[PDB]
Amino acid sequence: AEKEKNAAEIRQQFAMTAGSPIIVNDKLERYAEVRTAFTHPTSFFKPNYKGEVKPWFLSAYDEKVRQIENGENGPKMKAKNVGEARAGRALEAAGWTLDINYGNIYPNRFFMLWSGETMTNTQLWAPVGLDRRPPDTTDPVELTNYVKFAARMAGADLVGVARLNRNWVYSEAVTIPADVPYEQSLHKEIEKPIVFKDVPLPIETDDELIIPNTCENVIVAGIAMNREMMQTAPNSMACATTAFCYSRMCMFDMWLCQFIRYMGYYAIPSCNGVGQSVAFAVEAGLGQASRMGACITPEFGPNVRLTKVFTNMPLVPDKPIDFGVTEFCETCKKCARECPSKAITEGPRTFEGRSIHNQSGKLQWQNDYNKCLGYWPESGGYCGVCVAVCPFTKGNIWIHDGVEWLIDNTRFLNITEVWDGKINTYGLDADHFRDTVSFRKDRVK
Amino acid sequence: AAEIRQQFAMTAGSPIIVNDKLERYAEVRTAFTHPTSFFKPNYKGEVKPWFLSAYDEKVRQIENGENGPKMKAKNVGEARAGRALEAAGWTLDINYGNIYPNRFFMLWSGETMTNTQLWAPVGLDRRPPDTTDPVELTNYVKFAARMAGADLVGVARLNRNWVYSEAVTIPADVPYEQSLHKEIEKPIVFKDVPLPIETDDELIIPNTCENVIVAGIAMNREMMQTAPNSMACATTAFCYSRMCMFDMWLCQFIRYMGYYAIPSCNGVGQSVAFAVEAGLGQASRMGACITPEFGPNVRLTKVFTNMPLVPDKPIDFGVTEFCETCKKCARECPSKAITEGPRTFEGRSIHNQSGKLQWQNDYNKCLGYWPESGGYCGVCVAVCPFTKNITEVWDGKINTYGLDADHFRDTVSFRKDRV
Ligand SMILES: Oc1cccc(F)c1F
Ligand SMILES: Oc1cccc(F)c1F
Ligand code: SF4
Ligand code: SF4
Ligand code: SF4
Ligand code: SF4
């Protein structure tokens, strides 16, 4: 008979021995965040459909407007009517409500405060003194169970812990000066170094963002996106599940940082800022790196967003996982073949970046992320075709052969219906939600 | 669960029985806010705002290694963790409930929000609606509501009887750090105006504001069953922040569809009445809306809008007749706040709205137990048949947002059950 799926068993079966799985060489340096395609001057500008050169997201706005006027849900993709086209973009735009300027990357600004002191919640609770009382628990085992339980309350579908590898922390962040109001933010962005110093608490000076040398650990969360909506990539409903998950990330960071602070430790939120989420997720055992470049998880494949929190709270690091992704990506190449911009390489992994947007010195598939971003104004969205076509995104991949779990190799061989179809709270799917049930034994060993 | 809900659909019409004495209720009359109930002694005999006296009890409990009143924790560390989780859960909530309208997270226009500003070149909030069909709009907005974190969603015509006559708020330029000391009353009125607007004198809801969308946000059963101890406080708190995110997300969706939207959380009006009229559940002896999926172990929020929508039908699955003979909450209530008598139209005190048929409870007695116990009690929710130690909770089953995969299939939704 069919053995019922057991996600905890799967992770136990594929657990590796301790050690960062990412292979590096001597040319590895920390990466300046301004080099990402979203921010770098070589890639930031893209033409719109009239040939006007603009910040990429403004060119994409132009395409969204054109699609709604023409009753389309995506490039060359007719909607049922203009109202359906309108509804998809209204859902997408609303999803971003709790996210600043597409990713919350400015450290210690807006929602990403590095101290809780000025928050309305901290002020309301100040008489209890939870953020000023020394920790009552220093045992990493108990702290790991407490913080992972809190992480699930805070909206994580996956959570893992790693020691902080500074190689993945940006050498300089993109931010804004502290006196700049929101309406000027996009015009006043600056770079600011992230440094590690012997100080008691995270602190920002005029010159530096300072992380304490005591900042030992990173907690990584996976925030699951909706399968049906992502499968509409590159059209608007894939944009909407992306957007809503960014606001879920923001809530997660603030909730968890406050819990950690109220336990007597400090906590640094980040969302898409501070450092490279995929590398942290791999080191924390959420999944493995992939050809497309994302972290592929056993539960969701790559169809999951990542955020992370940095802390001095003593914790037990999780073990990395190896469930064969590297070997499958070596022969699969579906994302590379379906990529509308040919951004994803079909070749082997190397240590040599394809362009300024890649960090050299770590073994990975090297993709051209300027080509990727170029498709976003063209399509009026955030694409996601690679996530959508990846076999690991299917809910169907795990089988048990009577002895152990394995991947089913057979897997690698419209929007109106989405609006009219299955949905549940936060876009989670009750057919798979048991996969993320958690007891103490899977939170800490 | 879609089976049961249409099996128990009533015909259209508000099921709340009223008389000609009914008047709209001033929000300041709630036990949280009224001067006769706001101050309570702490365990040392010092009289303070009730939540400050409760704070003193939380500190005393942590020091004494307790998770609740006379409830020893495994150690001081466990006691601390429960209160840290509780305090963190409130991160996206202002002053216990987000009640001040058109302040902080509860803005009545999206125009100044960072998200609206970023999206302004697209013009979604300025473009006339492309859809005016209430059937399609009901399907769209309910789908959005599930994306926004509602476990239940319903629609009713707006009954102004349940809108507060006057809100508790603060002056618009008062900074957060002075908010608790500068609360004021302000009338909520309905006028022929295009958009929701606030003047120096009034909160003005348009006469075109036809509908209310009510969301149920499920609490965690294991944690609520620790009532009156700290983990019940934590699931309460996290759900208040889920309420706030729901309101903001859904208001933005409605605005980007070409309509206006008023968020509320615990402000603006009486959630239980709206929830009953929108078919989420039935009123109960304890006073909560009891739902088939969660019983009373579910939080409520609501959004008011001129968006054309199809009202849901009220539901009758026998709660009234069950509460008539049960009385379990009334017998377990640590403060004897809940009546064992029959329903009447006459409030027991200033905290009740007279003129509607309900079980009349003494809500000052309830609030009095909160500083004593250092929490938000919830024993009534925990013991209710419809709802069905702390170390075992921390070591036990949990899942995303505290939802339970053993029951999460009950809130799956297709178009057939949305409209
Ligand atoms: O604008 C964005 C859209 C989707 C994902 C991102 F990280 C973005 F910055
Ligand atoms: O349910 C609540 C719990 C604590 C404080 C409040 F104001 C509430 F409304
Ligand atoms: S589509 Fe294939 S090659 Fe690309 S990331 Fe997925 S498994 Fe790897
Ligand atoms: S998001 Fe689209 S354009 Fe970018 S790599 Fe994936 S498939 Fe290619
Ligand atoms: S919350 Fe507690 S004190 Fe209040 S009515 Fe319920 S059981 Fe009674
Ligand atoms: S405990 Fe019994 S009387 Fe009280 S609300 Fe629940 S069913 Fe009704």
Token couple for B252: 């933005």
Beta bridge partners of A162: A218
Half-sphere exposure of A423 toward its Cβ, with a 13 Å CA cutoff? 31
The whole-angstrom separation of Cα A247 and Cα A73 is 22
The whole-angstrom separation of Cα A366 and Cα A378 is 23
B285 and B320 Cβ atoms separated by less than 8 Å: no
**E strand segments, A140-197:** 158-163, 172-175, 190-197
Within an 8 Å CB–CB cutoff, is residue B151 touching chain A? yes
Q: Which residue has the tokens 């735009």?
A: A93
Closest ligand 4 atom to A371 CA: 3
Residues in CB range of B199: below 8 A, 6 or more apart: none
Residue B50 burial (CB count, 10 A):
20
Token couple for B30: 């709630």
The whole-angstrom separation of Cα B373 and Cα B371 is 5
DSSP calls for B335-391: T--S--S--BSS-SSTTS-TTB-B----HHHHHHHHHHHTS---HHHHH-GGG--HH
B214 and B271 Cβ atoms separated by less than 8 Å: yes
| Nearest to A325, CA basis, from A289, A363, A293 | A289
DSSP calls for B299-341: EEEEEEE-S--PPPPPB-SSHHHHHHHH-HHHHH-TT--S--S
Token couple for A423: 């949905």
Alpha helices, H only, B187-334: 221-224, 230-256, 271-277, 319-326, 328-332
| Nearest to A358, CA basis, from A260, A279, A270 | A279
B213 and B141 Cβ atoms separated by less than 8 Å: yes
Burial bucket for residue A413 (CB in 10 Å: 0-12, 13-18, 19+): exposed
Beta bridge partners of B169: B184
Which residues of chain B make contact with A380, given a CB cutoff of 8 A? none
DSSP calls for B172-186: TT--GGGTTTS-EEE
Residue A19 burial (CB count, 10 A):
9
Any ligand 4 atom below 6 A from CB of A262 = no
For chain B, the 3-state helix, strand and coil shares in percent, each to the nearest 5, are 35, 15, 45
CA distances from B386 to B143, B363, B380 (A): 27, 22, 11
The B residues from 60 to 99 touching A (CB cutoff 8 Å) are: 62, 75-77, 79-81, 83-85, 87-96
Beta bridge partners of B216: B152, B300
Residue B207 burial (CB count, 10 A):
11
Q: Which residue of A230, A335, A345 sits with most ligand 3 atoms within 8 Å of its CB, as the best mutation to test the pocket? A: A335
Any ligand 3 atom below 6 A from CB of A328 = yes
A381 and A239 Cβ atoms separated by less than 8 Å: yes
CA distances from A87 to A59, A355, B156, B206, B417 (A): 20, 38, 22, 24, 20
The whole-angstrom separation of Cα B57 and Cα B43 is 7
Token couple for A381: 């969205």
Q: Which residue has the tokens 């300024």?
A: A356
The whole-angstrom separation of Cα B101 and Cα B90 is 18
The whole-angstrom separation of Cα A297 and Cα A43 is 29
Alpha helices, H only, A221-349: 227-230, 236-262, 277-283, 325-332, 334-338
The whole-angstrom separation of Cα A329 and Cα A389 is 13
For chain A, the 3-state helix, strand and coil shares in percent, each to the nearest 5, are 35, 15, 45
From the CA of A370, the nearest ligand is 4
The whole-angstrom separation of Cα A131 and Cα A260 is 9
The whole-angstrom separation of Cα B212 and Cα B305 is 6
| Nearest to A413, CA basis, from A303, A302, A331, A322 | A331
Token couple for B104: 């902080």
Which residues of chain A make contact with B146, given a CB cutoff of 8 A? 423-427
Number of H helices, E strands in chain A: 15, 16
Token couple for A149: 């339980």
Ramachandran angles phi, psi of B198, nearest 5°: -115, 130
What are the b/e assignments for A59-75, b being 16+ CB within 10 Å? bbbbbbbebbeebbbbb
Within an 8 Å CB–CB cutoff, is residue A123 touching chain B? yes
Token couple for B392: 């075992």
Q: Which residue has the tokens 């929710």?
A: B381
Residue A251 burial (CB count, 10 A):
24
Of B87, B143, B397, the CB nearest to A437: B397
Residues in CB range of A328: below 8 A, 6 or more apart: A391, A392, A407, A412
Ramachandran angles phi, psi of A205, nearest 5°: -105, 180
A293 and A304 Cβ atoms separated by less than 8 Å: no
The whole-angstrom separation of Cα B369 and Cα B50 is 10
H or E element in which residue B410 lies = none
As for ligand 6, residues whose beta carbon falls within 6 Å of it are: B 284-286, 322-323, 326-329, 383-386
The strands making up A267-268's β-sheet, listed across from edge to edge, are: A158-163, A217-224, A304-311, A267-268
Half-sphere exposure of B195 toward its Cβ, with a 13 Å CA cutoff? 14
B251 and B261 Cβ atoms separated by less than 8 Å: yes
Residue A52 burial (CB count, 10 A):
11
Within an 8 Å CB–CB cutoff, is residue A420 touching chain B? yes
* CA B341 centroid distance within chain: 26
Q: At what angle do helices A236-262 and A140-153 cross, to 10 degrees?
A: 140
Start-to-end C-alpha separation, chain B? 15
Token couple for B240: 């208040």
The whole-angstrom separation of Cα B276 and Cα B272 is 6
The whole-angstrom separation of Cα B393 and Cα A298 is 27
Structure-determination approach: X-ray
DSSP 3-state of A398: strand
| Nearest to B213, CA basis, from B167, B148, B169, B164 | B148
**Is the omega angle on the peptide bond into residue A234 within 30 degrees of 0, that is, cis?**
yes
Strand A190-197 with A203-204, pairing: unpaired
| Secondary structure letter of residue A342 according to DSSP | -
Half-sphere exposure of A378 toward its Cβ, with a 13 Å CA cutoff? 9
The whole-angstrom separation of Cα B32 and Cα B114 is 32
Residue B396 burial (CB count, 10 A):
14
Token couple for A309: 């929190």
From the CA of B300, the nearest ligand is 2
CA distances from A187 to A61, A176, A177, A180 (A): 18, 9, 11, 10
| Secondary structure letter of residue A354 according to DSSP | S
Tell me how many residue pairs between chain A and chain B have CB atoms under 8 A apart: 254
CA distances from B355 to A155, B64, B161 (A): 42, 46, 10
Any ligand 4 atom below 6 A from CB of A344 = yes
Any ligand 4 atom below 6 A from CB of A375 = yes
The whole-angstrom separation of Cα B1 and Cα A429 is 16
A385 and A339 Cβ atoms separated by less than 8 Å: yes
Give the Å distance between the CA of A102 and the centre of ligand 1.
5
* Angle at the Cα of A376 from the Cα atoms of A375 and A377, rounded to 5 degrees: 95
**E strand segments, A256-303:** 267-268, 288-289, 295-296
Q: At what angle do helices B230-256 and A140-153 cross, to 10 degrees?
A: 40
A223 and A249 Cβ atoms separated by less than 8 Å: yes
* CA B248 centroid distance within chain: 15
